[PDB]
Amino acid sequence: LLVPKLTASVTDGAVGVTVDAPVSVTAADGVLAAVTMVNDNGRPVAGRLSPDGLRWSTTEQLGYNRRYTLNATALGLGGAATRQLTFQTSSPAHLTMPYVMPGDGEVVGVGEPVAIRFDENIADRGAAEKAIKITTNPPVEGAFYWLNNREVRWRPEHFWKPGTAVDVAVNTYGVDLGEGMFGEDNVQTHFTIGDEVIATADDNTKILTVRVNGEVVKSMPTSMGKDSTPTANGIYIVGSRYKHIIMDSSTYGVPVNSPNGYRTDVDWATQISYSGVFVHSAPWSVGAQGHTNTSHGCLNVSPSNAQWFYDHVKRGDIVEVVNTVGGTLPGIDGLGDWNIPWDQWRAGNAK
Ligand SMILES: */C(C(=O)Nc1ccc(OC)cn1)=C(\Cl)S(=O)(=O)Cc1ccccc1Cl
Ligand SMILES: [Cl-]
Ligand SMILES: [Cl-]
Ligand code: NA
């Protein structure tokens, strides 16, 4: 004649209960006859009893700064049992919203990292990383690395293989991300890796050679940064692409009428670094393309070739610059992720 026993995922009088998980009640030596949970305003939280009557769980996300009262009743062959539990959830000092790139359903190149950018500084980087679940198919190992206080990146050791599915579940709602900062919401994104496209700009030849799945499909002469403002070597990730884009140097503090000033509407511009390196149309430098470097760091190419590049590259394709007189693109540029050695990237910078 055992009385039914009830087990809850919460404790009476608990405080700071995180809302990153549903609340459940389980019955033994009997079944749940009724389970209810209401907040301080009397409003119930949606839940569902399992078909066998042994498990009840909330199906609606709980809220912050709330007081919940949980009531459960179990009936068994041996009698009846009831419990009442009250608890209070986390009271964030501030919330932060995550933003994920690339976009959901996108087809990206083999260089595209997963990016999760928050709208606030993240004090507990480890908590953030733990709340982000990455699925890859075919599965490959990857690791997180922070570009700054708000944006973390995830990538494998080598370029993605085409045909790879990437699933990104940012499960930050209810997660304490440090110093009272909690996740404002969850985000779900999924994308796929398309064709391997790798363009190599070699300063020795001043040719930009585009290889699609290992085959050279296009060669175009280029003029890169002049010796005083050279184009950094390294691996660049293709970012945004513009049919045309207005650029004004005074926007960033450089007068237009200075030696390094400019104010023009640029055609067929493909971004390959946050620092400002673009592939774009440079009709004025057609003669120097393939012979001498004349730009401020951009890879200048012909109008038809710049349009060709715009048409044939996608977000996440790779541009690799070699043999310039400049240094190496910073790994934390924003599109320079691949320039960090794997051992450093894997080790991370969570602490
Ligand atoms: C790239 C760049 O270096 N463009 C460039 C500078 C100078 C010359 O003279 C031959 C040719 N191309 C960029 Cl993103 S920029 O910051 O310098 C803006 C700019 C300025 C002039 C022309 C095009 C562009 Cl995108
Ligand atoms: Cl630049
Ligand atoms: Cl720029
Ligand atoms: Na309360």
Swiss-Prot record:
Its main location: membrane. One of its GO terms (biological process) is cell wall organization. Induction: Is expressed at a level higher than other LDT paralogs at all phases of growth. The active site is at 280 (proton donor/acceptor), 298 (nucleophile). Ca(2+) binds at residues 176, 179-180. Its EC number is 2.3.2.-. The keyword NADP does not apply. The record marks 298 as: Binds to carbapenem drug (covalent). One of its GO terms (cellular component) is peptidoglycan-based cell wall. Residues 197-322 form the L,D-TPase catalytic domain. Pathway: Cell wall biogenesis; peptidoglycan biosynthesis. It is a lipid-anchor. Generates 3->3 cross-links in peptidoglycan, catalyzing the cleavage of the mDap(3)-D-Ala(4) bond of a tetrapeptide donor stem and the formation of a bond between the carbonyl of mDap(3) of the donor stem and the side chain of mDap(3) of the acceptor stem. Is specific for donor substrates containing a stem tetrapeptide since it cannot use pentapeptide stems. Is essential for virulence in a mouse model of acute infection. Monomer. This is L,D-transpeptidase 2. It comes from Mycobacterium tuberculosis (strain CDC 1551 / Oshkosh). The gene is ldtB.
